[PDB]
Design a protein around this ligand. Structure first.
Ligand SMILES: [Mg+2]
Length: 126
């Protein structure tokens, strides 16, 4: 039927210290935020699914971006790291399991890692 990009953000691990955490996911300029996970130490089990209806099709070149922040209600969000992927493998195989490290604002690899599944599929389950 009509297709969608579906992103199941599972866990973010090897976090530093203790903080409320929040995730931001973006595709084609449309962003969603996860719920805030309060008082989280080294692993944030977001376990949240995000959906982008796609009117026509997705090209190999398009990018999915994930950003993870330290949240506090009276302060601006503080960026921890970013993950980007091109969607070539997702478009080809319909489903891709991601397990990888985040990148900081100087292109350096940090220990904080991300676990998620990315799908391109019929919205209705088929
Ligand atoms: Mg969910």
């Amino acid at each position: 039927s009509h297709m969608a990009l579906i992103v199941h953000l599972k866990t973010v691990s090897e976090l530093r210290g203790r903080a409320d955490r929040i995730a931001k996911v973006t595709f084609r300029g449309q962003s969603f935020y996860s719920r805030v996970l309060e008082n989280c130490e080294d692993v944030a089990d977001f376990d949240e699914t995000f959906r982008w209806p796609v009117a026509s099709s997705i090209d190999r070149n398009e990018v999915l971006e994930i950003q993870i922040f330290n949240y506090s209600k009276v302060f601006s969000n503080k960026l921890i790291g970013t993950f980007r992927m091109v969607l070539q493998k997702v478009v080809e195989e319909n489903r891709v399991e991601v397990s990888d490290t985040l990148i900081d604002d100087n292109n350096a690899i940090i220990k904080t890692s991300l676990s998620m599944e990315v799908r391109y599929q019929a919205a209705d389950g088929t």
